[PDB]
Design a protein around this ligand. Structure first.
Ligand SMILES: OC[C@H]1O[C@@H](O)[C@H](O)[C@@H](O)[C@@H]1O
Length: 278
C-alpha cells in the first residue's frame, strides 16, 4: 500500500451511462511480492445495493497461476472459463475490457487473451468494482467504435502547448503501416506519425503547402502487430514529445506554429479504440 491517494480498494464506481458495444474499460495497477489475488467485476445494482447479478467477474489468481472468468445471476454462478495468468507476484498489471454485441473482449498487457460470450444482458451492468491485492493506479471508461480512415476536428483550442492527445489503437495483425495526422485549419500537417512495419521504423514528417518535409526516422519502433498501444502526443513549446506505452519514443521539433492544431486524421492498417484530449 504505497502512495495510494488515487483509487483506494475496494473500489466501487456507479456508471453514469450504460456500458455499450465499442466502449473499453481500462484498469492498471501494481501488485506486491505477497499479492495472492484481486478481482474486477462488472455488476448490477440499483445504486449501492451491491449483491445482485454480476454479468462479468474476473479473478486474477497468482496462487493458481490463471485469470478466471464467470458470471453470477439469479443467485448462482455458471462454469468458470480459464486462461493463463502472465503475471508474477509483484509486477504491474494492465487489463482492458471492451464491450461488443456478442461478448466481452479482454486483453492483458494489451494482448487480447479472452473473448467471453455474454451470458446475461450487457445492459444490466450498472456498476464496476475492483478489490483484492492490487494498488490501482489508473481507471478509465470510454471510447467507441471509431471508423478508419477517421477524421475529426479537435475541441476548440485544439492541441496546443500544454495539452496532449491520447490515442488508444491496435496495429492490425497483418497490417503494414498506418498513420496519424495532426492538422491545422488550412490543411497543413504539423505532425505526420507513420509507423512502417515493412521498414521497421516510424516516420515523422510535416506537410506544408502540399509539400512533404525532411522526414525523421531514428528509433527502433516499440509497436507490434496485433498488440494494443497507448499513443500520446504531448505538445510542448518547442517540440512534440511522442510517447508510446508510457515511454518517450521521440521528440519532434515544431516546423509549424503550434496552437490552432484542430484537425485529426487516422488511416491505414489500424483499429482505433480510444481518443481523448488531455
Ligand atoms: O511525399 C512524400 C511522402 O509521402 C507519404 O505518403 C509517405 O508516407 C512519406 O514517407 C513520404 O515522405
Amino acid at each position: 500500500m504505497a502512495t495510494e491517494t488515487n483509487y483506494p480498494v475496494p473500489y466501487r464506481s456507479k456508471l453514469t451511462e450504460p456500458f455499450e458495444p465499442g466502449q473499453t474499460l481500462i484498469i492498471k495497477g501494481k501488485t506486491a511480492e505477497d499479492s495472492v489475488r484481486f478481482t474486477i467485476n462488472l455488476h448490477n445494482t440499483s445504486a449501492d445495493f451491491s449483491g445482485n447479478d454480476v454479468p462479468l467477474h474476473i479473478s486474477v489468481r497468482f496462487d493458481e497461476g490463471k485469470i478466471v472468468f464467470n458470471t453470477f445471476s439469479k443467485g448462482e454462478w455458471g462454469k468458470e472459463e480459464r486462461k493463463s495468468n502472465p503475471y508474477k507476484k509483484g509486477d504491474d498489471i494492465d487489463i482492458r475490457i471492451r464491450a461488443h454485441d456478442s461478448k466481452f473482449s479482454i486483453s492483458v498487457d494489451q494482448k487480447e487473451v479472452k473473448e467471453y460470450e455474454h451470458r446475461v444482458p450487457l445492459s444490466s451492468v450498472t456498476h464496476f468494482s475492483v478489490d483484492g491485492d492490487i494498488l490501482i493506479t489508473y481507471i478509465h471508461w470510454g471510447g467507441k467504435y471509431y471508423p478508419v480512415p477517421y477524421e475529426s476536428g479537435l475541441a476548440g483550442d485544439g492541441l496546443a502547448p500544454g495539452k496532449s492527445l491520447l490515442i488508444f489503437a491496435t496495429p492490425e495483425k497483418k497490417g503494414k503501416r498506418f498513420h496519424i495526422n495532426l492538422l491545422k485549419k488550412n490543411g497543413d500537417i504539423a505532425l505526420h506519425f507513420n509507423p512502417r512495419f515493412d521498414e521497421k521504423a516510424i516516420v515523422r514528417n510535416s506537410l506544408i503547402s502540399g509539400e512533404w518535409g525532411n522526414e525523421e526516422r531514428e528509433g527502433k519502433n516499440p509497436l507490434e502487430k496485433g498488440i494494443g498501444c497507448d499513443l500520446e502526443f504531448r505538445n510542448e513549446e518547442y517540440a512534440f514529445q511522442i510517447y508510446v506505452d508510457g515511454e518517450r519514443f521521440a521528440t519532434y521539433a515544431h516546423r509549424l506554429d503550434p496552437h490552432d492544431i484542430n484537425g485529426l486524421q487516422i488511416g491505414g492498417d489500424v483499429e482505433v479504440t480510444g481518443i481523448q484530449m488531455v
